[PDB]
Structure formats: C-alpha cells, structure tokens
C-alpha cells in the first residue's frame, strides 16, 4: 500500500483504491495502473520534473529503502494478475529489486522530488508507474 500527497492530491495505485477514493475521483487510467482522488489536507511530498534514472524506492517487505536503476518510461506486457486482463502497461519503468504485491504503493524517488510508485513485480524486478508528465499534479 501507499500514496503520493501532493497539493489536494491523493496518488494511489488505481488496483488498490479505495470507496472513498472512488467517491472524490479526479483522475483514473487503467492502461497505467493510476488513481487521483481530492483531499482535504495539502500534502508535504513534491513531483520530479527530471531525466533522473536513478533513484531510490521505499520496499514495505523489508521496510527499507533501496537505491536503483531504472528504465525509462515505456509500455510493457503485464502478464493477466487477480487485479487485471493481460494487457500493454504504460509509463511503465523497470529495476531489478525486491517487490511482493504488497509492495505496491511504495515511493520512488530521486534528489528532484517524487518520480512514480511501485506498480508491478516478481522475479527480483520492480516497475513503478511515472508520475513526471503529469503536470496538473502542481496546480489547483
Ligand atoms: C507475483 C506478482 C503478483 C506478479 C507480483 C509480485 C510482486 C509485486 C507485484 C506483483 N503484482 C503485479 O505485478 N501485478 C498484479 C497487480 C497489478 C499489477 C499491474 N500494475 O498490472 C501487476
Ligand atoms: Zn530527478
């Protein structure tokens, strides 16, 4: 589990949101594994607006924070899972590091801010869906 607060904004993976998530939606994309939903309270996290691939993620199976290398956002064939129908993920970014699928929800991050969230794994590999191109996050 895990969420980006950034602004009125909640960032969280669109396979784990929430009724309440549901109820307050601003955004959502399937193809990206994306969820935005309105808060009352203005969060404290800020969005990169960087070429960084490097960063660091926050893994909640080993409650520790590990430096990576990662892949440039791309689409990607996600295997059929409990949450989804086999299909192309985009802006998708892959590293090689220790995920479970409660993994999900953990921040990546770089010396530029928040980058994305983890959104896939297994197999020693986590991908995280980018955050950077979103724009909007920054206003409103
Ligand atoms: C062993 C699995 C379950 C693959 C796994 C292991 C470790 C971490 C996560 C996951 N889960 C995963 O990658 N899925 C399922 C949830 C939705 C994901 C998506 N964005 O389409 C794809
Ligand atoms: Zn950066």
Redesign the pocket.
Known sequence: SGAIYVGNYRVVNR?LATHNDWANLVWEDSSR?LLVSSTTAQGCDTIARCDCQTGVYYCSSRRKHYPVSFSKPSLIF?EA????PARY?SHLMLAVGH???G??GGILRCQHGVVGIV????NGLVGFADVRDLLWLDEE
């Not at 899972?81 to 989804?84: A, G, I, P, V």
């Not at 959104?119 to 297994?122: D, E, P």
Request: with cysteine; proline share 6%.
């Open positions: 396979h594994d996600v899972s409990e949450y989804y993920q995920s479970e699928p993994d999900c959104s896939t794994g297994g």
